[model samples]
Target chain A: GMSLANQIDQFLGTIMQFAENKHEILLGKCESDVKLTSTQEHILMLLAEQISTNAKIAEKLKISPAAVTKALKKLQEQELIKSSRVVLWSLTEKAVPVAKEHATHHEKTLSTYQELGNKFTDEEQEVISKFLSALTEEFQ
Target chain B: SLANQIDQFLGTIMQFAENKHEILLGKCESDVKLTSTQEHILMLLAEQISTNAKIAEKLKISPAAVTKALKKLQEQELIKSSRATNDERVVLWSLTEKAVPVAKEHATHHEKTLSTYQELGNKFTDEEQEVISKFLSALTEEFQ
Candidate 1:
């Protein structure tokens, strides 16, 4: 048998692969259905959280500001988002509903977890959340 | 803090996941360094005889990318192509004996990954697993 740490590492590696594959598949579906690239969708989602400048978006996404500009231009052209002469960007009214619908669709696609969630008690859910938080911190 | 925590969690998981995929791909063999896309094509070939067009359609990639992947696989001698006997205009692709072991190994890796996931799932109560699944789903959606 492998060492406990090795087994845990292997488990993490497999889980990450599974998660990434699921992520890519969901991204493809959303892109095809909404005519938006993953980057574009991410930008919209970020804007949905708060209006941001191009520089801020680029920083948060770890992409170059030029890339943010290009994506913003495309989003503007699509009428999914808008920016004033001031350069702060926010989702358009049209984009609001689109983003909302995308979120709903994404949640539904991942609804398998919903059944899993139903199995936990309130305190157990808290424990799981704490465990994940700790795991995330360890990586950081 | 919740949003930030969620973002960090998602980012870390995605980075780790991509790293795992890269490491797995790099371990394939010395003669062939298959990309994820190429590995996918190989998997498809393992299943059935397929044309470039069919592979492209199935993978949702351009025919050009598929051709490039096929060329790489061909160079490694893991795959071979031939003119379809029934249709001169069409070409068919299939895996070679050398590819059989590689393909099997890849499948084994995939199976192991699934079992690992299941094992982890078992560590949680069913309800906790559900919560995690939902949390992951939401994180993926919002962070994307």
Candidate 2:
């Protein structure tokens, strides 16, 4: 029999697969009617939060400024986003539905995670948080 | 403190989740030198025979991109393709014996990730483990 550690590993792998599959499904549906890459969808979701410059978007997405510029141009061509000023960009009317859908998905996923956290006692929650911090630090 | 910290923790989890594909690809043996997409394709082929259309559909890539990746895998001798019995025009892809050891290596890499998490799990009590298991299940169910 596998160890508990192995079981947990397998569980986490399944979780990762599930998240990836859902994203692909969502992208597939979105792309059937529209032609947006995952990177572009991420940009739309970020911009939906607030108006930002290309540099800001690049920084937030951890991508090159040139890539952000290219994506913004493509979005503009598709009428999904527009430059409101010399530096700032915002979603166009055609982008509202897309942005709204993206936001809804984000909210649902986050809330479900948060709901899980709420199930723990205060002390256990602290333990989980510490575990996460350590895990992230190791990756760093 | 609990509320804000938990939010931050979840944010970190989300960020780590985004990089999981990169993490797996990085863990691949240096000699293999497979990209994340290529690694994904190998995993799929390990499970069963798949055609270009099936691979493209499952991976959410274009048929052309699938063909390109398959070409690389073919060069590596990790996978081979042959004409389907029913349809001469259709190609069926399957893993080669050379890929079996590589798949096992991937499985080892996968275990390494879990061992890292298990080390953290050791710090928790049984009750804590129960809570975490439930939390993970809830998060996974949302995606499903």
Candidate 3:
């Protein structure tokens, strides 16, 4: 018979794709005048964490320093993020509303995961976390 | 009832891809280059079918770059390319048995992660547990 690992991979792959679909679905729902490119939206989320310079942003997002400069410029034009002179960048006051909305998107998506888990009875609930934490051990 | 158990459980597990894709894909590095570019294409193939120019457009790079990475994937036996039946001019790519493994050491990962399930089988019939495992094997292709 086919092995458990393929099943889990299939299970994980299908579920991951479902999550990707939801991420795009929520991105469509984001409220803004300028349609935020996915990369720009991620940059906003990164800046929300802390002030970061071009190289740090580029490295963290795995984008090029060249693209990072253009995206940061795009965000400033929208007044959603600001740069201190040159190196460090942070979200502006106007960004708070959009950032919170994006944060809530993640929250909602994560909550859906929990909700799916909660579908299992307490019996299965225990099994679910055992598998999650057990596998979590493997990945870490 | 049993379907819900596996579906909901695996669905939660599925969300794990968002942050840990690197970790997950890193585990998949048996043959392919598995770089950010290749990994991106692999995951993209996992999500949807592949198109040469469409993939290039999606990555915002030239078709040559997409073609180059795809060549390696084909060489590794992870993918086989074909022309659209309706149109010979367009090309398509699909994962092969080589890539389907997402397997091997992953079993070692499952070995550790699935330890609790040994007790799970104790709680349920071996038939039920068997159903879940094989059932998931089938589900793995739900996206592909």
Candidate 4:
């Protein structure tokens, strides 16, 4: 059987895809008339949720400030995000549809877990949760 | 088949939890053990805003939580707070030179983790990647 950590690595890798090809993987088959990079799509999802200050985006995506700066400027040029007197960035009303569509991908993920978790008995799940917690404790 | 998938999913999640633990226990060469909140606070003070109240808003946490983080920063001598010239209730804090380089170093360490994970990502096939994308979301539901 394959090792479990390999599975874990791929899981984190999936989340990390936006830094590379998240948009292609998730929405490649959809319309692409607007043509946003994965980083830009990731930025949209983030602003759809929380404050989208340049520093905050840079930190979350693990990109440099300069990289975020250039990307935000391009996004502003596209009118997808606009600055509130340079204090923060918010999506223009035009961007919400895209953001919601992006958010649906996340909702589906939520459902997948629920569906799979249901297959395990509560007794089995409790044992797994404890096992996960115990393994986590090793790092401390 | 479903049973085997469950084992694979559970095993992966257990391993991913282990991986995240190591990431959180990141190697920063700082003398002070700054919490993630504190590190972000320091970075904000260095590159963005100055006020703790605003930091609270920026972090989407309680103002008191910001103050608590500031206290640790203060104790570590990374920040210096004083009352505004006239109003005693309006306390203000500023970043010390002490935290600037540490914040910058922390930023570098963040990319190190990211780059390492980037390499780690290429190990899976497209179908396995989908399995990952789906199952990872399942774990997020577990948390949420």
Best by TM-score: 2
- Model 4 agreement with the true structure over B11-67: per-residue lDDT tens digits: 343343432322332567766677666876787777753677878877667898888
Positional deviation of residue B13's Cα in model 4 after best superposition, in angstroms: 9.1
The true-versus-predicted C-alpha distance at residue B7 of model 3, in Å, is: 16
lDDT of 3 by residue, A1-140 (tens): 33444455445545555455332323125565556775687678778877899999888766689998898998998899877765788998888767766767655645544555555566655554454444444443
Q: Write the per-residue lDDT of candidate 3 for residues B25-139, one digit (tens) a residue.
A: 3344445445555656765666577798878887666798898999998887778888888989888887776665543334344454445334433444555445556434444
lDDT of 4 by residue, A6-27 (tens): 4554444443332132322242
The CAPRI-style docking tier of model 3 reads: incorrect
The DockQ ranking, best first, is 2, 3, 1, 4
Candidate 2 lDDT: 0.68
Misplaced by over 4 Å in model 2 are A1-4, A21-49, A78-80, A84-86, A91-105, B1-30, B35-74, B77-107
Candidate 1: which stretches are off by over 4 Å? A1-140, B17-31, B137-144
Evaluate model 1: give its lDDT.
0.65
Order of all candidates by TM-score, from best down to worst? 2, 1, 3, 4
Q: Cα lDDT for residue A27, model 1?
A: 23
Report the C-alpha displacement of residue B36, candidate 4, in angstroms: 29
- Compute the lDDT of residue B29 as modeled in candidate 3: 42
TM-score of chain A of each: 0.65, 0.75, 0.66, 0.67
Give the alpha carbon lDDT tens digit for every residue of B15-132 in model 1. Answer: 5455434323214442456666677677778988899999999776679988988998999889998899888989999999988876766666555644554555556666666666
Q: Deviation in angstroms for B24 in model 2? A: 3.9
Q: Local error of candidate 3 at B48, Å?
A: 21
How high is the lDDT of residue A6 in model 4? Answer: 49
